Every structure is written in C-alpha cells, then in structure tokens.
Predict the structure of 4-hydroxyphenylpyruvate dioxygenase.
Amino acid sequence: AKPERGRFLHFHSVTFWVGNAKQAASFYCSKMGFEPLAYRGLETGSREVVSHVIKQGKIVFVLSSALNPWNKEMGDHLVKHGDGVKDIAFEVEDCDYIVQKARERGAKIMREPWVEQDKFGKVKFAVLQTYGDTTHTLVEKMNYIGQFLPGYEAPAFMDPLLPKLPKCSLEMIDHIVGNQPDQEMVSASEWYLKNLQFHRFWSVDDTQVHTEYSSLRSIVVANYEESIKMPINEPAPGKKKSQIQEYVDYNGGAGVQHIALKTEDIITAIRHLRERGLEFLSVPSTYYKQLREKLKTAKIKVKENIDALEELKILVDYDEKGYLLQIFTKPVQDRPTLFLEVIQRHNHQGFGAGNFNSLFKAFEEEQNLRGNLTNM
Amino acid sequence: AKPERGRFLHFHSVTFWVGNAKQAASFYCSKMGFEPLAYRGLETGSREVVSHVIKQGKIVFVLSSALNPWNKEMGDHLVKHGDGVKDIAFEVEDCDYIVQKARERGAKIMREPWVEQDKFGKVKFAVLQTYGDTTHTLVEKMNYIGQFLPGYEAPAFMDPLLPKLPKCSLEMIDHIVGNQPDQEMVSASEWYLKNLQFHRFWSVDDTQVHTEYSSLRSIVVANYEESIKMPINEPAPGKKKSQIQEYVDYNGGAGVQHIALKTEDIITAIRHLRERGLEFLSVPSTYYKQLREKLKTAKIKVKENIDALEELKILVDYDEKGYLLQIFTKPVQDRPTLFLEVIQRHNHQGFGAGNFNSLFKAFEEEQNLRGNLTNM
Ligand SMILES: [Cl-]
Ligand SMILES: [Cl-]
Ligand SMILES: [Co+2]
Ligand SMILES: [Co+2]
Ligand code: NA
Ligand code: NA
C-alpha cells in the first residue's frame, strides 16, 4: 500500500556524537577515504557544539562534540555509549505530512518542523525519536543548492595527506543496522511501519542465523520505494551470549551497530582501505574452497577474481538472479559497539542469509577474543 | 641544595584520558610520527580500561578510555575536560623515599607504593595528586628489561600505512606546561618545591610576556639535575582575557596546556609533520625580516637556513651562548585546551622570553579567531 503523501528519498547523513570531533573526522578521512565537506564551531559562531562534516561519494558523516565542560545531553550520551551514532537523517519530500502522520500514529517529535535559510536557499527539518537515544532528522530541501546545509561553513582545514592516499571508491550508504535489547526487535521495527509507513522487507530467525553457540533474529524495514533499508536485530537463544547482547552490554542500550557503505569496485575498495590501515574481520580458508565448489552449479557467475576475494576476506552470497559481496570492519572504537561494512551488489537489492550467517560467525570469533562469548 | 635521597631521572610517559583510545592512538601515529608500542584491553584481560601505548624515540604516550558504560571517574573527567592529559609519569630512583618525603611535606598520595612483576622483572609505582585532576605516577624499574611495563601486551594492530609516512624525528619530552586558574601559579609551583624538592628554574611576569591586550605569568620548576622542566602558568592582567584563562574556561580547571617534544632536526621534523597533515600556528612575515637584522649583531650563529625556518613558521630566540627553535601546533581537539610543541636546542637548556612572547602572540591570534579574546 503506497503512502498517501510524502517520500523518503535517501539517507541524507549520519551524525555521530564523539569525544573528539577533530580526531574522529581525521580517522574517517585517513582510514576510510573521506574528505572534509563542512564545519561549524567557535570560529564560525557555534559556541556549544562543534561539527566536522566529511563526505565520500554521496556518504555524509557529521562528527560532533560538546565545546564546553559539563554538557549534560552530550556528556551523558558520551559516558553511556562512548563514541557512536546519534542521528540518522533522511532526505524527504513533504516533511510536514510525514511529521503529522507520525505524531497521529504515536511517534515522539523531539523537534517540531523548522526552516533554516542561507544564500543558497531554504531547508526544512524535523526530529523524531527512534530506538534508544537514536533520532531521525528529516531534511527537506526547498530549492537549496548549497554543498551541505545552512549553518555550516567551509572546512576548518584541508589535510594535505589525503590526496596522496589511494581512493576507496565508496559511493553511498546502503543500509544501517540497529541492535535492540532482548524482545525489542518487534517494537523497534513496528515503529517504522506504524509511524513512517515503512514496510517489512526481509527477516531471519535464529533457525537461519546461528553458530553452534549463539544466534540472533532480524527484521529489515524499508520505505515504500525501498531506497532506505534498516535491519533491526535482537539477541536470540543459544548456549552462549549473542553478539547482539554484547552490543547492548557495551552500548548501554539500543543503538546503531553498523553502517554499510556501497561500492561498485569492492576489490579496489578493500585493497585501498587495507593500505590506509583499516582492519577487517577474517574468514577461514575452507570457506573459499567451499565457495569455488558451490559456484560450479550456481545460476549466477561471479565476475570478480575469486583469488582476490579470498585474499581480501570478502564474503559472497547469491540467489538465482544475482549476488552480494560483503565485508565487515573491526569496531571503530574499543568498546565492541559500532563497525562498518562495505557491500557491492550485482543484480541483488536484498540480503542473503548465507552472508548473514558468515558475517555473524566472523563477528563471533572476535566476541570470543574479547571474553564475551560467555555461557548463558 | 641537593635532596638527601631519591632521583627523578626523566619523564617516563604521559597518560591521556580520551573518548576513543583507538582513534586517538591512530591520530598521534598518523599525524605526529608515533608507532604502537603496547596494548591492554578486553583481549588481554583488562576489562575496565583500554590503553593504546605509542612511542616515538623516548616519547611514550598512553591513550586510555573506559570500556564500560557509566564509568564514574573516567566519564566525569571526560565530560569535564574533553580529551586530555590525566597523568605525567616520572622514572625515579628511591620511590619509597620520594613518597614518604612528599607525604610528610603534605602531598596527597592517591595510590601507595606497589610492585608489579612479569617475566622481564619488577616495577614499583606510586601515584601523587598534583594540580587540577592531574596526577604523577612514579616509576621505579627494578631490573626491568621489558619494552614497556607489566600488564601491557604487544600492540593490538601494526598499521601498514605508518612505515610509508615520512619520519618526524621527535626524540624525547622536553617540558610539560600546566595552566592554573587566577592566583594559583604560586601554589601549584610550590607543590613541586615543597613536596618533591624541585627548585625554581625560570620565571617571567606580565611585564615580559604580553601583547597589547593580554598577558600571563609563569614559574618553571625543575628537579635537582634539571632533566625535568615544568612551566606553571596563570592568567595576568590585560584589557582582554588571557589565553591561560581561555584554557581554564574550556578545561574546567587546571591542567596540562602543552607537551613539548625535542628534535635534533627541526627543519625535517616540521616539513614531515606538515606532510602528514599536522597544523601549526603562524607568524607574520615581518618577524623574519626583524630576525635577519637582529642576527647580524648576535653573538651566536644560527646554522639552520633562515628561509626554511621562515617557510615552516619556526620561532628563534637566543642568549649569548646558544639558541632555541620552537613551534606550536594547533590544539589537538576542538576545545582550545591541549596542544604540542616541537623544540630544538643549540647549547641552550633554558627558555627565552623572546620566544615565549612570540608564541604567546601566535596563540592569541587563534584565541581571537575563536571569539575568546574578550574585554575584561
Ligand atoms: Cl546449525
Ligand atoms: Cl608592550
Ligand atoms: Co550489513
Ligand atoms: Co613550551
Ligand atoms: Na536516487
Ligand atoms: Na639521560
């Protein structure tokens, strides 16, 4: 059923609340191939919050910190979560309708619609509360031709190391995953269906994704046109603690687990990300032997050199029409909370339970290294 | 008067409490030429605190974060200060004497002497409280031949970008500066004299270091053998706010303002630091014209090419026997608290009021950019 009005066009940006915005922006630029896009802070008249905005392709990350001692909201969030995602922004049409419908349906509107303006045009915003402390900012451009948004200026500094580093080829945000406490997958996913008129796109249960020790459940929600996809996970039964529970343990509650970044040349992307010093999970050699055998009878043909996929530890899954290439980074902070994913799609716009299982097992290895794969 | 017993050999290390230890270590390695030395965290059995230890020459920085939500001590310090220095460690002989004398003299002993042991030998430690929330850890090696200390293991990861970046040539910690609130310079410096049997090494007042708008006072304390030098600053009068007060405003109290790192090849160091993307303060062109004229009658001869010093914005000061080359970085976080300095000494083991004045003016320019050079 197509929503009567409104559209969620694409992910706009992801806002992180971090301990040191300057250093965080530096990390993502150096290690992951981002470049500075915009800035606000003391030098631009923003006296409570500093933000470094960085971009790669269509991907926009906003790294923000408090400027003053004893900031209650940002300081509490920092002590609770460590560095992590605060807001997932969507570019929309008809923000007014979307907010009114969401309110009538029971969503909490943290910030009522407001308009900001600069010499490049106007932008309308609204803020809704989703799971945990995570929010969604709705962004409706009203003939806006600026490079980012009102209230942000050119970058504080253009680091001269960045043009010397190899291009990472990341193009856009593919999906974003939210981990929930035990028995909160349904409520957190229903939020989207009820309030935003998203629909259920995919799901897996603990009979599909599990190791000998642990498991999860997941429901993926999507907007009508399926340009926005968000898996929602919860822990599920096993002899040992689910990695989704490890996340909740270290995050202090629900929150964003991973942001997946799409590329059209994953071999180049991962080679270059590794050259820049980014770490990824691993996969046993047996996996690639099994893959080569299974590919002999698959209806699809993988065009990437399997030797390169093996060397780079990329995971392959397929249906009868196309295939998916996926790899997870190690967590981007010491708490085992947030990490990122690189994904390439070949005539496949969904998810694969094979890759979900393989990725789950690769993460579980690290969970056990951390001493957190403990008997229930 | 030589202390009856005990010796403070050298700075051992500086411990930072930061929001994201992994990213911070990455910043210092990439931008400033450090390499990983050691690690403790979940994978090594340290379940409350993660630490990434990095080294360059004799310089050792320890970047630490809390691993769990709602860590009181580290979380409060993070919200109060942002990322910054928690502890300045000294390598000592006769830790027992030093602690007992300090206690008798009135110092607060945060942690009584204790011994840790591994297969490389034993190390004795003690912790004393200095200004603000800053502590000193005393480190006495007892036939210890390990690369760092007990309780830390090999690095979590050796980033493969680092060997590809140019060498920064930093050798050892030269001095560390503590900024105090109004009228606390004397008490904070006296702490060293009374408790540790340091002595006054140098001082300047607001008649020596000032611009048209602002000023400071400083007292430098040193150990008997003068291997350890620590300037202690306070704000002083002016039409506008002192940069030392700006620090206190943003730090929430007293704390470390800058760590100075010594090099024997400052031209190479600064060229390579700039290539890696580190930002430094600036100096007007007039300064170098004046310098060239003054050098015509100086008793010393500067061996570095003055054109290179000008291009790199290095500041020169001298007495009749030798000279000092100094440059400040921009702050290493968005709050204008901590920054670093690179220093080269040529037959000059003290400080120069000329350079102190020039460095003060260079910082004041940035303070004004931040909107913090406000009328008193
Ligand atoms: Cl099974
Ligand atoms: Cl004057
Ligand atoms: Co994913
Ligand atoms: Co200095
Ligand atoms: Na599109
Ligand atoms: Na020595």
